[PDB]
Every structure is written in structure tokens, then in C-alpha cells.
Amino acid sequence: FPLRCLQISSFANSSWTRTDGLAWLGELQTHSWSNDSDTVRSLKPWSQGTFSDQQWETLQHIFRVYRSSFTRDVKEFAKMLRLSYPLELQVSAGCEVSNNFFHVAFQGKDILSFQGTSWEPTQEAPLWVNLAIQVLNQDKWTRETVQWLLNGTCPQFVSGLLESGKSELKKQVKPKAWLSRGPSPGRLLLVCHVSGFYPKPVWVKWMEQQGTQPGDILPNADETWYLRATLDVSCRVKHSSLEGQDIVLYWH
């Protein structure tokens, strides 16, 4: 179960920005952070993990400095590289239990990442990224501080998280299914609805006829999922919650 620290920064123009962030421990989000929040919010009653309260404020301080620095830094890179607003940078940090990773992307395209002891640009990255790397790699303290978090802190943290709040992580929920009629493409449209399951992994097919179109896995407000399987002309469902019990629904 990887811990993904995400971040979306939007820069409308030179003088309008917002940077919001979140954290996914596996398929379940564990933290939240908005541009208009001076702190980081705790969603689940165990988002502090096993880290002390005299150390959780250290992470709080670090990200505060990072946020205001990152915003000014991109604003300045925009001047240097003549980049034209708007700009959209995402940042996908994180690790697992222990290789880590730190990928940043510009306008939805990978431009660089933190491999090794510094910043290394991506394969199909534009030429002007070399300019960014050349300057990012001047800051010595920042380069080691990422290491201090990626190679040591983050792996020790996810350990603390996965312990404090594991009941909610191995939590099983049995779903429910129903069949419906979809808009006729003399062809008809059989639709096998599935909703409420947990965790995300699932297998639903129209058994198996080589024409089943199992749709995407859509989320529900209660941290569960929803699946819509269709067929153009029974329906079988296997899940971890319902052990061995394959939810076969007969038509009609």
C-alpha cells in the first residue's frame, strides 16, 4: 500500500495562484491541505500515525515553507524561461514499504523527477528543462532535505500509519448487484450494476461471452466503489468480501 503525496498548483496569471494537496495511503485518502488552510487537516483519526505530537509540528512547518517557496519559485521560473501563463504543475511524491519516488509534471506532462541525490529530467522533456535542473541542483540544502524525507522519514512514517489504522485498511464490505435495461442499440443492452464493494479490486463479466464491456470503477461517497458491466445482444461477480460466493444474477 503506497503512500502517495499529491499536489496540484494552478497559476492563473502572474498574481493569482492556488496550491492544494492530499495523501493517498493505498486507495484510501488520509490527509488534506488547501491554499486557504494555514495547517494540514486530518481526515481519519489516525493521520498522525506513530509520529509524536512534538514532531508532527515539524512536518507542519516544513510544508508551510515549501508551499510559499514553491509558489515563488515557479513564478520566477516563468520569468526566466519566458513560459506563458497559465501554468499547471502536479507533483507526485511518496514511497512504500523500500523504494521511493518524486515525479513532477508540467501541463500534464512529465518533465523531471528526483532520482538519486538530485534532479534528473525525463526522456521526452523539452530543452528548457535543463535550465531548471541546472538551477534546482544548486540548492544543496533542499536536495539533501528531500533525501532526509524520502529515504528515511517517509518509510518510517508509512510504517507508523499502516499500524495506527489498519482495521480500516483490511476492512471488508459485501456489495449488492442488480440488472437493468439499457438503451437498445433488434439489438438490446444488458447492464449488470454492482455497488458498495471494498476494496477496489473486482471481477465482473457476463458469463464468459466474448463481448462483455466491464466499465470503469466509479467511487462512492462512503469510500466504496461502483461498477457497471454491459453486454450488447447471466452475469457473474466475484469479490474478496463475499468469499467464494460468486454473485450470479439471472436474466430476466
Partner: T-cell receptor, first 114, second 113 residues
Amino acid sequence: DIYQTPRYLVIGTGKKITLECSQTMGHDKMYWYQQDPGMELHLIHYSYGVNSTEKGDLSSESTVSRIRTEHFPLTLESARPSHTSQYLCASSGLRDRGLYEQYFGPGTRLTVTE
Amino acid sequence: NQVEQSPQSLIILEGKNCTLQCNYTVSPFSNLRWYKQDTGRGPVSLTIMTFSENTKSNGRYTATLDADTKQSSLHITASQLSDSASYICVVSDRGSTLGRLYFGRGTQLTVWP
């Protein structure tokens, strides 16, 4: 390794003044300051490298042109009795330690007359 | 003005040592320099320190760095006539060349016989 010529420069008004600032070491970061005798240092121009030229603190009529890494000339479109000051050039770059320090140019005193 | 710097000007006799101050409210803090500017010449970097340090020496010059109370002072030892100059204290806010530089107005030092 940052030079400035000339050290002194008297010119008439209305004309165009052009201040030479050069460097040997391959630093991409250079600055332009203005200082009045007794006062402090105000940023008027800086540069992250070639073709990059930015306006600093004070909005001066001065303009700069970074076309070569080693050069950073400053230009006044039209002199005036208030544009009489001293102009210092600077440059950031990796020094003896692992930090990026600033070396200052010798300086150029300017006097505009009528 | 984020970098204050006291005293404004002062006049001391030769042979004595004085202590010039420099209080900054710049954050985040990476490094801090001290420059010596003769009347008519350009700034010549005396020292440069980061928050982990708190004492560097350039022979007769010894700046300290109180990184916790955000101040730093230059201690001119055995001040001779040649030390009459301006003393400028500038703080950078990054560890690269992507930062801003914050210059204090400086301290004017006069040394008499």
C-alpha cells in the same frame, strides 16, 4: 574577474550613455545597482543569462542587453541631471565554498551636465 | 525593509574594537553576507555564513550568526584608520541563484586618530 570601463564618465544631456560591464568566469547571473554617495544600493536590472533581462527594484529609464554570457552593458535612452549617480555591476557564482557568492564590479561614476 | 542594521553611523578612535549589528526578518533564511565598501569603490565580501554556523574570521574581522534570534554582528578587531568604510549586511533567501537578495542600508564607520 568582473571589470567595468570606464571608471569615470562625463557626458552631456540628451545623449545616450552606455556602460560597459564584462566578466571572464562563466557566470550566468549578473546584476546592476545604482548608488548615490551616502545612500544605499538599489537594484535596477538583473539577468539569469543570455537574452534574459529583468527589471529590479527601482523603475529606471535604463535598459540592459544580455546577448553574450561575458557581457552585460547598461544603456540610457536619454540622459538627464537626475540620472547622475554611481553604477555598480555584480555577478553570482560558485566561489571557494559550496555557496553562490556575489562579486562586485569596480564601479563607474557618472556625471550629466547641461 | 526586512533587513534592519544598527547603528546608522558611528565614529570611533583607532586601536579600539567595535561591534556592528544586523537584524533581519527575512524567511526562509539560507545564507548571510557582510560587505565592506570604501568610499568610491565597490563592496568586497568579508564573510558569508549559513544558519548552522555562528562565527567566521577574516583576519581582523569576525562576524557571528545568532540564527535563532535572527541577528548577526561583525566584530572589527583592533580598528585602524583603514577600516573607515561602509559595512553592508545582505541576506539571501535561497540556496541557489533563484533567490532574492536583501540589502541593509549599511553602517557608516569612521575611525579617528
